[PDB]
């Protein structure tokens with residue numbers, strides 16, 4: 001008859017858990033109700049300091065202003081060009097703020113996905129080693145390049161026929177150093193406006209200047225590059241100014257440091273000679289179609305995780321393979337799997353490879369002119 | 376660079392009806408019409424070239 005302890009503890013534990021969770025809800029709404037009344041502030045940048053009390057700032061939204069600090073704003077922090085906060089009404093300076101990020105950078109900074117490293121690509125062991133020697137060594141050990149006393153090369157240009165894996169080599173670097181790959185696709189830059197693209201270029205170059213080991217990567221340049229015109233369409237004017245933004249601030253007077261620019265194109269014949277000189281892009285690095293041993297290497301790289309039997313004359317497939325791509329023999333293995341699912345074999349027979357090779361032969365009877373050497 | 380192998384993968388052309396698919400297509404679109412069926416469609420497919 002002593003079960004009243006269990007009943008009292010039941011009601012008290014029910015009420016205690018209810019009070020804990022309900023006062024936790026009331027406390028969350030209490031903090032979110034306390035935080036209601038605050039008022040936002042104005043983002044502006046410091047042009048210059050006028051006097052000890054006077055400060056010349058220009059916000060991004062329009063005109064210029066002259067105000068002063070509050071009490072404890074520590075005026076030596078305000079270097080000319082810092083981004084600060086302003087009141088909406090009183091308009092004086094509130095708090096020094098860190099610099100902007102412009103999340104167009106972030107959508108091409110964080111959005112590196114995973115990948116397999118440079119053992120996945122192959123047959124082009126010149127360029128792999130050579131890009132390593134020209135990039136990784138003057139950023140890991142600069143004294144090898146200072147004992148000689150010769151300035152390191154800055155810009156590297158990948159070029160060649162389409163489909164040689166010009167993208168995936170930089171992607172392998174993006175799975176090797178993993179440091180600050182700002183892979184700009186260089187087509188989603190221009191949107192509609194007047195000087196927005198120039199400001200994005202300034203933003204990228206400031207951000208690369210600060211985070212000292214940055215890798216600049218601009219794929220498919222020829223859209224934003226061009227060469228020059230006799231002044232035809234009006235949007236091409238701002239195109240050429242957007243290009244001359246890069247032409248100045250890649251070189252300027254303030255030289256870049258550790259700002260390594262990796263460049264790739266579909267046809268390098270249409271670039272501007274303003275961009276084609278060394279200094280900006282130092283060494284032209286050429287990739288071409290795989291040879292017999294190279295086709296063997298890529299084929300046996302793709303033929304690794306494919307369910308088949310010990311019958312594969314790789315020499316036959318590479319023998320019928322003639323002047324192909326990174327993706328051609330990938331398409332060979334893919335269509336080999338396709339022909340495997342054709343007639344439901346559940347392994348890949350060796351004749352499916354010959355069928356896929358003749359499918360590639362059907363494909364590349366519609367393509368030509370694969371030799372664009374610049375200059 | 377629009378194709379190369381596998382930007383688009385399966386390169387598929389479209390043939391024209393050789394002979395028999397002509398009568399097939401005539402049968403398909405004439406399925407809705409009411410026909411007094413004194414018609415060899417194979418005559419018509421055998422005369423209408425290309």
Ligand SMILES: Nc1ncnc2c1ncn2[C@@H]1O[C@H](COP(=O)(O)OP(=O)(O)OP(O)(O)=S)[C@@H](O)[C@H]1O
Nearest residue numbers: 121122162163164165166167168298325326327376
């Ligand atoms: N030699 C290779 N070895 C292994 N995989 C390769 C090789 N070449 C190409 N690939 C693969 O095929 C893809 C082809 O990449 P691409 O997009 O053609 O590079 P790219 O510079 O964009 O070429 P274009 O001119 O735009 S078609 C790569 O992403 C790899 O997955």
